[PDB]
């Protein structure tokens, strides 16, 4: 239970970081 | 350029976090 | 502005990751 | 052992994210 929940939180953070990366690419590219 | 480099590093960190999440799930499940 | 907002979100994610690290250390040590 | 090592990896990632945040702030500010 608790490790699975922490793992899920890490997966959500990874998704958030991928969103930020996309946003930075769009700023760079226009 | 710098934003492209940073975006790449964020994608790489996201991948690392997913690998850590996987290891946590492995520890939990056996 | 957008880079300031993103920087803030990265700092917030960093804080979250440290909180998760702390929880893992707590689980390990009891 | 293994949870402590994972926690340390998360702390290093948090430090890396703080570096990126600083870099973005410096880009924004000049
Ligand atoms: Na750039
Ligand atoms: Na900006």
Question: In C, which residues are within 8 Å of A22 by CB distance?
Answer: none
**DSSP secondary structure letters along C6-20:** HHHHHHHHHHHHHHH
Question: In A, which residues are within 8 Å of B14 by CB distance?
Answer: 13-15, 17-18, 21
How many other C-beta atoms are found inside a 10 Å radius of the C-beta of residue C14? 22
Q: At what angle do helices A2-29 and C2-29 cross, to 10 degrees?
A: 160
- Whether the CB-CB separation of C14 and B10 falls below 8 Å is answered with no
Chain D nearest C-alpha distance from C12 (Å): 9
Cβ neighbors of A27 (< 8 A, separation 6 or more) are B3, C2, C3
How many other C-beta atoms are found inside a 10 Å radius of the C-beta of residue A21? 22
Q: Do C20 and A27 touch (CB under 8 A)?
A: no
In D1-30, alpha helices (H): 2-29
Half-sphere exposure in the Cβ direction for A21 (13 Å, CA): 19
Resolution of this model in Å is 1.0
- Whether the CB-CB separation of B4 and A28 falls below 8 Å is answered with yes
């Amino acid at each position: 239970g608790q490790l699975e929940e922490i793992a899920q939180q890490l997966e959500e953070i990874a998704k958030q970081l991928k969103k930020i990366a996309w946003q930075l690419k769009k700023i760079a590219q226009g």
